[PDB]
Design an enzyme around this catalytic site. Structure first.
Site, short mmCIF file in Angstrom:
data_model
loop_
_atom_site.label_atom_id
_atom_site.label_comp_id
_atom_site.label_asym_id
_atom_site.label_seq_id
_atom_site.Cartn_x
_atom_site.Cartn_y
_atom_site.Cartn_z
CG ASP A 78 -3.71 2.30 -0.84
OD1 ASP A 78 -4.71 2.49 -0.27
OD2 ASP A 78 -3.73 1.51 -2.04
CD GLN A 79 2.19 7.40 4.28
OE1 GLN A 79 1.86 8.32 3.44
NE2 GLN A 79 2.99 7.73 5.32
CG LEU A 90 -2.13 -0.95 1.21
CD1 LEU A 90 -2.02 -2.27 1.68
CD2 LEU A 90 -3.48 -0.22 1.45
CG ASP A 91 3.67 3.46 -3.16
OD1 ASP A 91 4.16 4.40 -2.74
OD2 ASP A 91 4.11 2.95 -4.18
CB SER A 92 3.11 7.61 -1.29
OG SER A 92 3.40 7.24 -2.58
#
Ligand SMILES: CCCCCCCCCCCCCCCCCC(=O)OC[C@H](COP(=O)([O-])OCC[N+](C)(C)C)OC(=O)CCCCCCCCCCCCCCCCC
Ligand SMILES: CCCCCCCCCCCCCCCCCC(=O)OC[C@H](COP(=O)(O)OCCN)OC(=O)CCCCCCCCCCCCCCCCC
Ligand SMILES: CCCCCCCCCCC[C@H](O)CC(=O)SCCNC(=O)CCNC(=O)[C@H](O)C(C)(C)COP(=O)(O)O
Ligand SMILES: CCCCCCCCCCCCCC(=O)O
Lengths: 128, 182, 12, 122, 459, 172, 71, 81, 86, 127
Positions: free
Chosen positions: I44-45, I40-42
């Site tokens: 999704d962060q 879960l990338d930036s």
């Protein structure tokens, strides 16, 4: 559409609204490095002298006393009597004075037009 | 604001030549408006330094006494018979209504009193009606008796108020008795 | 546990 | 209010303007103007310290109201009866003033029809 | 009245022959003693002044000034304790001599019974202050500071001298009592209006007047700490005390041509107060606020209403004190940081709480908060002005707009707020600063309870 | 430095739902909205040449700013809130410890003894922390507001004193 | 602190409302319900407008002294 | 003690209307991740905050204990006379 | 406000990650770094950063809000932001 | 996207150094060494009176707390103002002014006993 915001002298246009700050360009990307470096050294020459145990005095800011001299001293050595300066001095000096003179001279005599043939109330005014 | 709206009413009564009706208004004014801030500050202390309506819910069950205090305090201010509103808010609204006044000087009072009744329930809703909106760390409390004591010492004011002094004070107001009912 | 609170020197 | 609506939205010649009323004598159509009298005289209200704005024709029940209230203490809950018969003169005086407003009004209506019938015939 | 004059004259052998260590200990311990001796002069009759001798006399107007000067003299002593500790002993004795000689000329000046005797001792005070401002000053411009001081004051002083001798040759005496009893109406001739111009512009210059005020910002700011208080506290007020004295023969021309001055004070008081709120130097604020209050008392004398003379005396002492604590306080930040920029030092109560307590009560004293005699004197000016003209209130009411707009402004950026984490120079408060702070402000609340003595001769 | 799409749309998404939670107040409504802006935010994460990627971004900010909650929610302890800079009044520097009165110095002896060794390790490690920093400093001073560590043996991480001796966030 | 917090709270449950604050809340609520409806019938005339107002069309010119349009 | 953290699934997303707003995204074709983050606010004792009317008539039950006594006391006053 | 401890305040946040239905309860780790250790990338962060902030009270500054990304490096900051030595 | 090792050891070296500051900032167990103060004996007897904690003893002590609060913060204050007005201020005329009470028909003035004119009949309103 929707209401549109406008820049102002105090309600300045936000960076988010202005597309100019979004115009990614090589000149701006390369420019930011210099401000990053000059602020870095300023942070460096702030911290070392501040964090120095030997620095028992006050660490002055060169920008600080440039401003203080500027705001008070540099005015007249750089002042030039332009026509607009005379006009602004007129409407902020003698001008406002004559405003008070005309208004104060009038009511004063307007009062003096009241007393002489008895048309002013002095029922309690015994503390002249 | 509901104060400054009220401070925009006592001098309306003297604006229609009613000094004492203004004077009793401020007495009840302090009686409930002290609480509204008192319980509000209790929320700020119980729920850690929070003031906005949109950060807390379910304050009825979790904060019963302050809920009761807020209910009656709004109930007192929103013109209700046999409390602060009766001898003061009901009296002023009727008084400016039948006395000689400008039409809009009247008009704001009914509108503002409606607005006072309006946003009083708006904060009551956001206070109690709504699911909890506070951080998972549960710390809301009022068990401190001294806070509880201070509320009830002013509770008697917020529900009794003028009645304790209604017939006690001499009547300086010129009554109207009969007048149209609407 | 209780930490330390610093104040300006006051005795003067 | 009906009086406010008729005066502004309708006709103010048929509606008593609060400052201009009364515009007709009390004897016009209502004879025997036998001056009414209240009871507790001007010394009485003066000796009663009575409020100037309240020294009305209902002054009689006023001072006697404050009589028992002077001895009603300690109990504040007393003298309800003599309280609301004072309201009855204030009731009576109010409708009398209500009577005054409409008496001029009914004279104001009649005045319109009067001049309409005694000036338009010719 | 040589009860006070001689012991001050003798104070010069005292300090000069004192030992190496004491000197200042000696200087204070006897200057306080002279202060309560001068506190005797609080004995006034109703209206007949205290005529001690042929050449010396005092009244209900002069006496509050005498007590102000005599009791002031210890204060610059202790105030100068820090600033001048490093210097050798001989100049130390010389510096105290300048202070004593200055107070010496002040007390005789306020108490002269002959106008020219007042004049000779009026401008005799610039000679020591010129020494104080120029020699013992700190910043470079102090050189031009002295030139601005004397030349401004003298530029009006000489016309007074020519006028004074003219009255001597015309009436036969310049003595206050004779000129008051034989006061004659000053006619409206062009010769007489210039005579009025001569006898007024001298005090107006070191009043100051709007436009004729540059010396105080260029002098008080760069004057030595001791010198700075003395200029604003009392050396402002020779013109005032003279002004109510010479205004006994200038009638009726005063009521006819005081309008340009009443103008220039009223706009100036708002103008000076507004610019006071917009300086980067804190020392300039007390200087610019001083004239703002000082411009008020010129209004008082011009209308010459009894109520105006009431507050002229009270505000004189009130402001004369008021500038004193602020200059004392503004000093205390300076040597600690060696700068007079309010921006550099902010929120000092987090480091110096007691100094802040003194700072705010001096500030609210400047606010003219009753029952303090600052307000009641300042208020009487408002009432007299309203009697002169009901409209007057708005322009001066604008002065009750700017004063607190700045008079609490340095508080929230010098004593109030947060601190910059780089100044480790700031240390605890030496008891001298708070002690002189105590003798500075505690009086003003004391005689506040009893305002009649410093109210003035119009009681 | 300059801001790139990732840094900026992360900035966008912070404020955007801060308005949304303040708009909806109640969790569940904003909950459905916040997770659907998420899909609405990834509904176009494949755009062609960066000009459109910038141009659609321009459309994001404008609707954001007029979709910005005019009265948004700000946590008090953070800038803009009630508790922002609240405890700076209680903030007090560490050098007031030095000028403590000797009688009062003997009333807190252990705490003054600990400050003695704390300022001791300040001095004995200041000169080594700085000399190492200048030699490892690239020419032209620092190129960014970074700080080298105590990468070598027996040293302290340069320019540590004030930030190690920073006043606590709740000085009370 | 360690030697206190008798309202000892926990994580994500009801903040252990002791019965006191509950039956306190219902106490003065009952008291002020009692107080205000007790007078809602004891002296309801105070709020109900004890004295009535007469509609003015319900009057006659004889008792009002207006002569009809004949004179 | 320790401000104890109870078990994770006490405040679990089921039963709460969080699925409805989560399925509202499933109506659009996705899911919501902060259901049980707030399920404690709906589950537990915080369930079903008293309605607005029930809030403003708090104490009316013990109030009903007060009405009958109040009118009954009033009925006593003139009936016994 | 209690004598807040890092152990208590992190166990609060490990709940949020296990309350993150996307971040599986077995996928929980004190070093669950979202884009590469979790996926879960930036984007999704950052919403999780607000999620913890919404439940933490403090607002971590944006310069490191997007950056402090592994649960321990975040809980290092609440240790810094609260400045408690436990 | 990514703490460089440079700054990773920077934080950690900064972390426990500041944590050790707070570790060294704890208030010492010795705290505070206090030189002897003055302990008054009447308060010694007063606190010793209610140590046992009986309900009556605690009430009496707080009653005595109220008592001395009466004597020198209420009872002495009413003394010196009472001495002030009616003995010094009212010794000066017109300092204290008094509106005559609203004397009412049927009442008797204490000196003459004159029954202020009895109220005449009423227009007989009743409801
Ligand atoms: C008896 C006395 C009168 C008779 C004898 C004198 C007769 C001649 C008078 C004029 C002399 C020459 C003037 C020279 C001059 O103005 O130079 C330009 C001068 C000097 O300019 P400057 O050289 O200062 O300009 C540079 C400025 N800085 C340093 C900031 C860069 O101009 C000015 O001063 C500004 C314009 C004139 C302002 C004054 C006019 C109004 C006066 C008001 C007060 C009146 C009392
Ligand atoms: C007799 C009745 C007379 C008229 C009464 C009118 C007011 C009635 C009561 C209104 C209560 C409003 C309310 O609930 O306020 C709080 C609420 C908070 O809204 P929120 O959950 O934050 O979501 C929207 C924002 N994003 O706010 C909202 O949701 C917005 C509601 C807007 C209300 C505006 C009130 C103005 C009334 C006076 C207008 C005067 C104009 C001149
Ligand atoms: C109240 C609500 C207001 C708001 C809503 C309502 C108003 C705005 C509506 C329009 C919103 C707009 O479509 C999206 C926006 O907000 S911004 C732009 C997103 N698109 C890009 O920037 C393209 C490039 N893409 C990347 O940079 C990476 O894909 C990314 C960083 C996104 C993920 O990276 P991954 O995590 O590694
Ligand atoms: C149910 C709503 C009833 C509204 C009645 C009218 C309100 C406005 C005031 C009218 C009376 C005073 C002015 C007229 O007379």
């Amino acid at each position: 559409s929707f209401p549109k915001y406008k820049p102002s002298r105090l309600a300045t246009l936000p960076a988010t609204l202005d597309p100019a700050e979004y115009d990614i360009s090589p000149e701006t990307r390369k420019a930011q490095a210099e401000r990053l470096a000059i602020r870095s050294r300023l942070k460096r020459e702030y911290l070392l002298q501040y964090n120095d145990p030997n620095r028992l005095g006050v660490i002055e800011d060169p920008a600080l006393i440039r401003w203080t001299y500027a705001r008070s001293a540099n005015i007249y050595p750089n002042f030039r009597p332009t026509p607009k300066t005379s006009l602004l001095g007129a409407l902020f000096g003698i001008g406002p004075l004559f405003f008070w003179y005309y208004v104060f001279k009038t009511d004063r005599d307007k009062k003096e037009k009241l007393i002489q043939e008895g048309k002013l109330d002095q029922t309690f005014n015994i503390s002249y | 604001f509901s104060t400054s709206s009220q401070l925009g009413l006592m001098m309306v009564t003297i604006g229609i030549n009613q000094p004492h009706l203004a004077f009793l208004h401020i007495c009840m004014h302090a009686f409930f408006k002290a609480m509204l801030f008192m319980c509000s500050g209790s929320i700020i202390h119980s729920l850690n330094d929070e003031q906005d309506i949109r950060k807390m819910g379910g304050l009825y069950k979790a904060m019963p006494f302050t809920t009761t205090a807020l209910i009656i305090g709004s109930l007192a201010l929103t013109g209700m018979p046999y409390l602060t509103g009766f001898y003061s808010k009901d009296l002023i609204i009727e008084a400016v209504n039948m006395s000689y006044t400008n039409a809009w000087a009247l008009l704001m009072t009914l509108i503002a009193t409606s607005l006072t009744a309006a946003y009083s329930t708006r904060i009551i809703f956001f206070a109690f009606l709504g699911k909890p909106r506070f951080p998972p760390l549960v710390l809301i409390n009022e068990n401190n008796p001294l806070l509880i004591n201070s509320i009830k010492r002013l509770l008697i004011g917020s529900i009794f108020a003028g009645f304790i002094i209604s017939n006690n004070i001499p009547p300086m107001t010129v009554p109207n008795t009969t007048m149209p009912l609407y | 546990k209780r930490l330390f609170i610093i104040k300006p020197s006051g005795f003067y | 209010g009906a009086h406010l609506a008729r005066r502004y939205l309708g006709d103010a010649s048929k509606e008593p303007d609060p400052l201009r009323m009364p515009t007709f004598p009390p004897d016009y159509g209502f004879p025997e103007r036998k001056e009414r009298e209240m009871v507790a005289t001007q010394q009485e209200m003066n000796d009663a310290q009575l409020m100037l704005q309240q020294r009305d024709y209902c002054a009689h029940y006023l001072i006697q109201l404050l009589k028992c209230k002077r001895d009603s203490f300690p109990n504040f809950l007393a003298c309800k009866h003599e309280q609301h018969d004072w309201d009855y003169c204030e009731h009576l005086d109010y409708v009398k003033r209500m009577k005054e407003f409409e008496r001029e009004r009914r004279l104001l209506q009649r005045k319109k029809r009067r001049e309409q019938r005694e000036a338009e015939m010719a | 009245m040589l009860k006070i004059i001689i012991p001050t004259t003798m104070l010069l052998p005292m300090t000069w022959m004192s030992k190496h260590n004491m000197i200042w200990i000696n200087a204070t311990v006897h200057s306080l003693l002279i202060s309560l001796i001068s506190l005797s002069l609080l004995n006034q009759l109703g209206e007949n002044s205290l005529n001690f001798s042929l050449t010396f006399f005092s009244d209900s107007l002069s006496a509050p000034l005498l007590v102000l000067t005599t009791w002031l003299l210890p204060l610059m002593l202790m105030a100068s304790q820090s600033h001048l500790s490093k210097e050798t002993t001989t100049r130390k004795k010389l510096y105290i001599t300048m202070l004593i000689l200055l107070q010496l000329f002040l007390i005789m000046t306020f108490t002269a019974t002959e106008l020219i005797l007042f004049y000779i001792l009026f401008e005799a005070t610039l000679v020591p202050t010129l020494i104080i401002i120029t020699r013992w000053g700190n910043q470079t411009e102090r050189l031009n500071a002295g030139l601005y001081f004397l030349f401004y004051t003298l530029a009006g002083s000489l016309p007074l001298l020519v006028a004074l001798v003219y009255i001597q040759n015309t009436t036969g005496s310049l003595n206050f009592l004779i000129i008051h009893y034989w006061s004659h109406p000053l006619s409206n001739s062009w010769s007489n209006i210039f005579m009025w111009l001569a006898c007024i512009m001298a005090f107006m210059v070191k009043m100051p007047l709007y436009g004729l005020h540059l010396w105080l910002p260029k002098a008080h700011v760069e004057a030595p700490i001791a010198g700075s208080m003395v200029l604003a506290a009392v050396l402002l007020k020779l013109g005032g005390y003279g002004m109510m004295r010479i205004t006994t023969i200038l009638n009726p021309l005063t009521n006819y041509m005081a309008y340009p001055f009443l103008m220039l004070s009223m706009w100036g008081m708002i103008m000076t107060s507004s610019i006071c709120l917009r300086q980067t130097d804190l020392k300039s604020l007390i200087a610019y606020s001083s004239v703002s209050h000082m411009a008020l008392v010129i209004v008082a004398i011009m209308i010459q209403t009894p109520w105006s003379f009431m507050g002229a005396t009270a505000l004189m002492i009130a402001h004369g004190l008021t500038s004193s604590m602020l200059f004392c306080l503004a000093n205390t930040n300076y040597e600690r940081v060696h700068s007079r920029t309010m921006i550099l030092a902010r929120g000092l109560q987090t480091l110096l709480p007691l100094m802040a307590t003194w700072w705010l009560m001096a500030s609210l004293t400047n606010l003219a908060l009753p029952p303090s005699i600052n307000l009641i004197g300042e208020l009487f000016i408002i009432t007299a002005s309203f009697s002169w003209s009901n409209i007057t209130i708005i322009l001066m009411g604008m002065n009750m707009m700017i004063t607190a707009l700045y008079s609490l402004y340095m508080l929230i950026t010098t004593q109030r707020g947060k601190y910059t984490h780089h100044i480790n120079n700031i240390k605890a408060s030496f008891t001298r600063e708070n002690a002189l702070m105590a003798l500075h402000i505690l009086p003003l609340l004391l005689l506040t309870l009893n305002p009649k003595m410093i109210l003035g001769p119009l009681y | 430095a300059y801001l790139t799409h990732q840094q900026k749309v992360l900035r966008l998404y912070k404020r955007a739902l801060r308005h949304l939670e303040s708009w909806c107040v109640h969790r569940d409504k904003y909950r459905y909205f916040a997770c659907l802006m998420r899909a609405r935010f990834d509904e176009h994460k494949n755009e062609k040449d960066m000009v459109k990627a910038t141009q659609l971004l321009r459309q994001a900010e404008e609707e954001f700013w007029y979709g910005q909650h005019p009265q948004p929610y700000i946590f008090p302890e953070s800038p803009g809130g009630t508790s922002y800079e609240r405890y700076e009044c209680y903030k007090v520097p560490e050098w007031c410890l030095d000028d403590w009165h000797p009688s009062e110095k003997a009333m807190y002896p252990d705490y003054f003894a600990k400050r003695e060794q704390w300022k001791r390790l300040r001095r004995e490690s200041w000169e080594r922390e700085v000399k190492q920093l200048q030699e490892e400093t690239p020419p032209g001073g620092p190129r960014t507001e970074a700080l080298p560590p105590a990468r070598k043996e027996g040293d302290l991480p340069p320019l540590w004193w004030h930030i190690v001796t920073r006043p606590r966030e709740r000085p009370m | 602190a360690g030697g206190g917090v008798h309202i000892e709270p926990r994580y994500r449950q009801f903040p252990q409302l002791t019965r006191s604050q509950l039956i306190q809340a219902e106490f003065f609520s009952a008291t002020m319900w009692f107080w205000i409806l007790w007078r809602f019938w004891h002296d309801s005339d105070a709020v109900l407008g004890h004295f009535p107002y007469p509609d003015p069309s319900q009057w006659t010119d004889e008792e009002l002294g207006i002569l009809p349009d004949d004179e | 003690s320790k401000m104890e953290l109870p078990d994770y699934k006490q405040w679990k997303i089921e039963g709460t209307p969080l699925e409805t707003v989560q399925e509202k995204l499933a109506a659009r074709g996705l899911r919501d991740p902060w259901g049980r983050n707030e399920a404690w606010r709906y589950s537990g004792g915080f369930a079903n905050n008293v309605s607005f009317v029930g809030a403003l008539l708090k104490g009316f039950k013990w109030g009903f204990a007060a009405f009958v006594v109040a009118v009954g006391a009033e009925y006593y006053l003139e009936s016994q006379n | 406000a209690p004598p807040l401890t890092l152990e208590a305040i992190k166990d609060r946040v490990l709940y949020v990650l296990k309350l993150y239905d996307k971040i599986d309860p077995e996928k929980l780790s004190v070093n669950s770094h979202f884009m590469k250790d979790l996926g879960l990338d930036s984007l999704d962060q950052v919403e999780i950063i607000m999620a913890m902030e919404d439940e933490f009270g403090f607002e971590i500054p944006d310069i490191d809000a997007e950056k402090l990304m592994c649960p321990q490096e975040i809980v290092d900051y609440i240790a810094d932001k609260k400045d408690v030595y436990e | 996207s990514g703490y460089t090792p440079d700054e990773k050891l920077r934080l950690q070296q900064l972390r426990e150094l500041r944590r050790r500051w707070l570790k060294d900032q704890e208030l010492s167990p010795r705290e505070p060494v206090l030189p002897p103060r003055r302990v008054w004996p009447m308060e010694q007897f007063w606190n010793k009176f209610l140590q046992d904690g009986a309900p009556w003893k605690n009430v009496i002590y707080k009653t005595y707390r109220h008592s001395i609060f009466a004597v020198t913060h209420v009872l002495i204050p009413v003394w010196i103002i009472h001495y002030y007005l009616k003995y010094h201020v009212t010794a000066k005329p017109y300092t204290v002014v008094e509106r005559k009470p609203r004397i009412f028909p049927g009442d008797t003035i204490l000196e003459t006993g004159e029954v202020i004119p009895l109220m005449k009949e009423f227009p007989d309103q009743h409801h």
